[PDB]
């Protein structure tokens, strides 16, 4: 199976994904979110029994290929889509007065990427930016842990932090006064003393190093989650979730107070 | 592949093997140092025998009074996350009793209970958040994912050793202990988490002694736990579609308890 051997290396490495302009998505529910949100499904691989899976086959008019149970078990899925990777265009992320965004600086864990995508999506954020030497958004561990939120929350990989600022300066020029907000071990202020009712990009650092200093230079404010003591820290996705929850709380509350 | 080796290897599989031997593996200088610092007995220390041996490893080896064994480096590839951290040192650490009295209960009690977790990574992450945010213990209910699973241990980032984590088979033993705490003078409330909870998390009074119940990743809290809840709370969501990972939810709800406690702003 020649087509299959192309599909198996789509899981294995970033290099071949981005040469083919596609990636693998598993599960009836995530695939349905992909279709629902406009992402082209080039191929749709299926085992040759569930009600949802059957409904997908006669609603999604694309290349439909039946598969042996042996071959589908590679990581077990009943349906698997080959879904079109879209360009890394920062204007895919909508920016309005209530702008609420996340920037993940140089993440090493794809699991953390997908996880923050899920939290950003559930808690009302409008986009994610994966800046710098990163693990790939379209890694299977990221896709999986997004739990389909990849498809509703636009996640843009942007090599340089310079290209991010140019898109930030431009939203500023339009009227939305985005403010860059770093997280720190050395936090200026408690997260709950800061005003998340304003257009906000939230900068979150590597799991093992902090935010890069260069990201700290561009940061207008810095916030910290108050901790119990000396040798305690939060996983980046967990910390990002808590801060997003605080932003939601203030916006609903109409105040910090 | 000594008979001893195979016994240590077996500590990576089912929870029962660890339990009956009363031990589990802890990998990495940093986690082992934290086990030693918080008084977890170390039965054996395995180190790399074709010796790199950093300053840290050397320091553990001449300070930790225990059985010490040089191991071929490929036996130590034993457990890693293949092509992610081959351990230079591994400790065989004693498992403490699953006794709820290891969790201290004061007037401002904040505890977490994780109902039959599917993912050991989620357990360790919650242990880490609870530790960092001032909770006083975790209970893990059921015979699903294990606190002492290598992924949990690893996820906790050493917090396992400072945050008392106790396993119970089912809700009965937990309610026994809770009713005893309330007779002594701490009116602990059970607070479940759910999507469609009775009130938003920021409208709940988290200053009160609180046992927070986090449900399983796909099935949520069991019917037995919902029946036992005094209250139910939820994090408000943007749409009908998405949801939160259990550990992420737990972290946010623990943070909200911290927020209301320090100085006391709302609820």
Swiss-Prot record, chain B:
The enzyme class is transferase
Sorted keywords for this record are:
Antibiotic resistance, Methyltransferase, S-adenosyl-L-methionine, Transferase
Substituting residue 128 to A results in: Almost abolishes catalytic activity
Task: Please tell me where S-adenosyl-L-methionine binds in this chain.
Answer: 193-194, 215, 235-237
* Annotated function: Specifically methylates the 2'-O-ribose position of uridine-2479 in 23S ribosomal RNA. Confers resistance to antibiotic avilamycin, an orthosomycin antibiotic.
What quaternary structure, including any partners, is listed in this protein's UniProt entry? Homodimer.
Protein name per the record: 23S rRNA (uridine(2479)-2'-O)-methyltransferase
Species the sequence originates in: Streptomyces viridochromogenes
